[PDB]
Design a protein around this ligand. Structure first.
Ligand SMILES: [Cl-]
Ligand SMILES: [Cl-]
Ligand SMILES: [Cl-]
Length: 163
């Protein structure tokens, strides 16, 4: 684990991360998809061999020796608010188990279910709080990746508030 486990946020493409492993915001079928998923497919295509996994779960596939943790958050257009919230919390819990199993000292993670799976809603706080709930008991350095300037500021404020 990291000597002083921390959270940081960066506004840039997660495919250029400087961490020991990456979390993909995957679809259940292991398809190239859009957004973060498509960038992950371009950078680590080999990690999509047998990466299909149900909603609410995470499945790790190696690209060489670099781990890609495919985490499947719910599409809020299909799920009710309550069941979608439960699946979103479950996907992050499975990410924490995989990061721990891998023994990595750092992990790059996007906010699950905040893009095309958001159902047209702003889910920054909902997704980030589930990320904290799952990752707080791990000792890896967590680096959250985002693309919007306003979201970078809000995620940074949420991280600083707890320190
Ligand atoms: Cl970039
Ligand atoms: Cl999404
Ligand atoms: Cl964003």
């Amino acid at each position: 684990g990291a000597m002083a486990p921390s959270y940081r946020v960066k506004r840039m493409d997660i495919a250029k991360n400087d961490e020991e492993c990456v979390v993909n915001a995957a679809n259940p079928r292991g398809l190239p998809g859009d957004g973060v998923c498509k960038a992950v497919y371009k950078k680590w295509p080999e990690s999509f061999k047998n990466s299909a996994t149900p909603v609410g779960t995470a499945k790790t596939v190696m690209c060489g020796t670099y781990p890609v943790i495919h985490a499947v958050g719910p599409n809020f257009s299909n799920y009710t608010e309550s069941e979608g919230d439960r699946e979103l919390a479950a996907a992050y819990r499975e990410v924490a188990k995989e990061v721990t199993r891998l023994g990595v000292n750092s992990v790059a993670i996007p906010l699950l279910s905040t893009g095309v799976y958001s159902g047209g809603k702003d889910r920054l706080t909902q997704s980030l709080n589930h990320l904290f709930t799952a990752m707080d008991s791990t000792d890896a350095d967590v680096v959250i990746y985002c693309r919007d300037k306003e979201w970078e500021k809000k995620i940074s404020e949420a991280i600083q508030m707890r320190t």
